[PDB]
Enzyme design. Structure first.
Site, PDB file in Angstrom:
ATOM      1  N   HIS A  62       0.832  -1.239   0.000  1.00  0.00           N
ATOM      2  CA  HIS A  62       0.000   0.000   0.000  1.00  0.00           C
ATOM      3  C   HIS A  62       0.855   1.274   0.000  1.00  0.00           C
ATOM      4  O   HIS A  62       0.450   2.267  -0.564  1.00  0.00           O
ATOM      5  CB  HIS A  62      -0.995  -0.030   1.188  1.00  0.00           C
ATOM      6  CG  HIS A  62      -1.785  -1.265   1.257  1.00  0.00           C
ATOM      7  ND1 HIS A  62      -1.556  -2.240   2.204  1.00  0.00           N
ATOM      8  CD2 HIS A  62      -2.881  -1.627   0.546  1.00  0.00           C
ATOM      9  CE1 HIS A  62      -2.456  -3.203   2.016  1.00  0.00           C
ATOM     10  NE2 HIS A  62      -3.295  -2.840   0.997  1.00  0.00           N
ATOM     11  N   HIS A  92       5.283   6.912   7.024  1.00  0.00           N
ATOM     12  CA  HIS A  92       5.030   6.584   5.610  1.00  0.00           C
ATOM     13  C   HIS A  92       4.445   7.807   4.925  1.00  0.00           C
ATOM     14  O   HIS A  92       4.107   8.778   5.583  1.00  0.00           O
ATOM     15  CB  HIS A  92       4.019   5.381   5.515  1.00  0.00           C
ATOM     16  CG  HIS A  92       2.734   5.655   6.219  1.00  0.00           C
ATOM     17  ND1 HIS A  92       2.548   5.440   7.542  1.00  0.00           N
ATOM     18  CD2 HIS A  92       1.595   6.300   5.777  1.00  0.00           C
ATOM     19  CE1 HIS A  92       1.325   5.887   7.856  1.00  0.00           C
ATOM     20  NE2 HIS A  92       0.771   6.472   6.816  1.00  0.00           N
ATOM     21  N   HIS A  94       1.531   9.114   1.650  1.00  0.00           N
ATOM     22  CA  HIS A  94       0.494   8.916   0.622  1.00  0.00           C
ATOM     23  C   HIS A  94       0.761   9.878  -0.512  1.00  0.00           C
ATOM     24  O   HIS A  94       1.180  11.047  -0.225  1.00  0.00           O
ATOM     25  CB  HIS A  94      -0.892   9.176   1.208  1.00  0.00           C
ATOM     26  CG  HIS A  94      -1.138   8.416   2.447  1.00  0.00           C
ATOM     27  ND1 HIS A  94      -1.864   7.203   2.409  1.00  0.00           N
ATOM     28  CD2 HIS A  94      -0.885   8.637   3.766  1.00  0.00           C
ATOM     29  CE1 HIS A  94      -1.960   6.731   3.624  1.00  0.00           C
ATOM     30  NE2 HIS A  94      -1.317   7.566   4.481  1.00  0.00           N
ATOM     31  N   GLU A 104      -4.056  13.310   1.827  1.00  0.00           N
ATOM     32  CA  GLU A 104      -5.311  12.751   2.409  1.00  0.00           C
ATOM     33  C   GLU A 104      -6.106  13.888   3.011  1.00  0.00           C
ATOM     34  O   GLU A 104      -7.230  14.189   2.605  1.00  0.00           O
ATOM     35  CB  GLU A 104      -4.909  11.730   3.457  1.00  0.00           C
ATOM     36  CG  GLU A 104      -4.317  10.505   2.796  1.00  0.00           C
ATOM     37  CD  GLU A 104      -4.452   9.210   3.544  1.00  0.00           C
ATOM     38  OE1 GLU A 104      -4.134   9.147   4.746  1.00  0.00           O
ATOM     39  OE2 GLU A 104      -4.889   8.219   2.889  1.00  0.00           O
ATOM     40  N   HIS A 117       3.001  10.854   7.176  1.00  0.00           N
ATOM     41  CA  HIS A 117       2.437  10.466   8.464  1.00  0.00           C
ATOM     42  C   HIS A 117       3.507   9.831   9.349  1.00  0.00           C
ATOM     43  O   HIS A 117       4.039   8.777   9.032  1.00  0.00           O
ATOM     44  CB  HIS A 117       1.307   9.462   8.181  1.00  0.00           C
ATOM     45  CG  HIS A 117       0.190  10.185   7.553  1.00  0.00           C
ATOM     46  ND1 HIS A 117      -0.811   9.373   6.924  1.00  0.00           N
ATOM     47  CD2 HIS A 117      -0.249  11.434   7.474  1.00  0.00           C
ATOM     48  CE1 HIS A 117      -1.693  10.182   6.454  1.00  0.00           C
ATOM     49  NE2 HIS A 117      -1.455  11.481   6.765  1.00  0.00           N
ATOM     50  N   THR A 196      -6.419   6.030   8.387  1.00  0.00           N
ATOM     51  CA  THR A 196      -6.966   6.347   7.065  1.00  0.00           C
ATOM     52  C   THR A 196      -6.933   5.076   6.218  1.00  0.00           C
ATOM     53  O   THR A 196      -7.226   5.178   5.060  1.00  0.00           O
ATOM     54  CB  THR A 196      -6.172   7.482   6.381  1.00  0.00           C
ATOM     55  OG1 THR A 196      -4.817   7.054   6.090  1.00  0.00           O
ATOM     56  CG2 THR A 196      -6.255   8.738   7.233  1.00  0.00           C
TER      57      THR A 196
HETATM   58  O1  LIG Z   1      -2.552   6.400   7.353  1.00  0.00           O
HETATM   59  B1  LIG Z   1      -2.414   6.092   8.757  1.00  0.00           B
HETATM   60  O2  LIG Z   1      -3.474   6.676   9.527  1.00  0.00           O
HETATM   61  O3  LIG Z   1      -1.764   7.156   9.200  1.00  0.00           O
HETATM   62  C1  LIG Z   1      -0.921   7.013  10.308  1.00  0.00           C
HETATM   63  C2  LIG Z   1      -1.451   5.966  11.268  1.00  0.00           C
HETATM   64  C3  LIG Z   1      -1.398   4.628  10.589  1.00  0.00           C
HETATM   65  C4  LIG Z   1      -0.909   3.444  11.137  1.00  0.00           C
HETATM   66  C5  LIG Z   1      -0.933   2.275  10.394  1.00  0.00           C
HETATM   67  C6  LIG Z   1      -1.425   2.291   9.103  1.00  0.00           C
HETATM   68  C7  LIG Z   1      -1.884   3.476   8.545  1.00  0.00           C
HETATM   69  C8  LIG Z   1      -1.898   4.677   9.268  1.00  0.00           C
HETATM   70 ZN   LIG Z   2      -1.047   7.357   6.470  1.00  0.00          ZN
END
Ligand SMILES: [O][B]1([O])O[C][C]C2=[C][C]=[C][C]=C21
Ligand SMILES: [Zn+2]
EC number: 4.2.1.1
Length: 258
Positions: A62, A92, A94, A104, A117, A196
């Site tokens: 992803h 990570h 997006h 986002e 993020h 998200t």
């Molecule tokens: O996109 B996401 O909310 O943002 C940081 C928090 C988190 C943690 C694990 C997977 C995804 C996400």
């Molecule tokens: Zn994220």
């Protein structure tokens, strides 16, 4: 038939496997800058990354995660809207197929090219898996990316991506300093929200920085060469891995700045 960002398994599908997709505190949201209220009671944010221990970088199909040692209080987020101590576990991004989309969160409906993020968990819950079951379990620092000048502190990330092209690939990623990804100003918006991505748990305090970082067209082009697919499979470029803005519902976005 797993979730993702394709025509057939994208965000508008996710509610079938994860009904909290249509819940009361979903993320991301549009930040209406004229409606967000300055909250003089918000504390300054304390980002304490000088002892951060990065370990590894993983293409999870992803995004890619830069993972940190969170077995002690090495890299932590405190202050601002937060009670207690939140340990950095990973960061990570997006991003989009083109520079006009990728973020986002949006700001007065403006989409940025990408969104970083930095994910932190509340140390009162002992581990990440317990934290995501709590309304105050996670704090995610969100940082917009715009395309212009190169971000020097991002280039070590860009240069390892060739080694993790496909889903399930990882590489050693020690001695990376995430302070190199921050903007000058820590002025922020904050609201209560969610992950998200599935499982879309309603466990996040969102802290979204007002000031974007600049990255080069070449840097983001390297993000767009990653793959969603595994090795040997038909190539699906890893682009447009963003969930669109969700209804704000009964929530107030607060500003740290006048
Ligand atoms: O996109 B996401 O909310 O943002 C940081 C928090 C988190 C943690 C694990 C997977 C995804 C996400
Ligand atoms: Zn994220």
């Amino acid at each position: 038939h797993h979730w993702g960002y394709g025509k057939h398994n994208g965000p508008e599908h996710w509610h079938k496997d994860f009904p909290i997709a249509k819940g009361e505190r979903q993320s991301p949201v549009d930040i209406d800058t004229h409606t967000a209220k300055y909250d003089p009671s918000l504390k300054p944010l304390s980002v304490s990354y000088d002892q951060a221990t990065s370990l590894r970088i993983l293409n999870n199909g992803h995004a890619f995660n830069v993972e940190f040692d969170d077995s002690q209080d090495k890299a932590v987020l405190k202050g601002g809207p937060l009670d207690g101590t939140y340990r950095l576990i990973q960061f990570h991004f997006h991003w989009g197929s083109l520079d006009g989309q990728g973020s986002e969160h949006t700001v007065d409906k403006k989409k940025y090219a990408a969104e970083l993020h930095l994910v932190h968990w509340n140390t009162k819950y002992g581990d990440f898996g317990k934290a995501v079951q709590q309304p105050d379990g996670l704090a995610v620092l969100g940082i917009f990316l715009k395309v212009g000048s190169a971000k020097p502190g991002l280039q070590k990330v860009v240069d390892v991506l060739d080694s993790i092209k496909t889903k399930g690939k990882s590489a050693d990623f020690t001695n990376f300093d995430p302070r190199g990804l921050l903007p000058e100003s820590l002025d922020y918006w904050t609201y209560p929200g969610s992950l998200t991505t599935p499982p879309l748990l309603e466990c996040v305090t969102w802290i979204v920085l007002k000031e974007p970082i600049s990255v080069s067209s070449e840097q983001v082009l390297k993000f767009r060469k990653l793959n969603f697919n595994g090795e040997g499979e038909p190539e699906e470029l890893m682009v447009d891995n963003w969930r669109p803005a969700q209804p704000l519902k009964n929530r107030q976005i607060k500003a740290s700045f006048k």
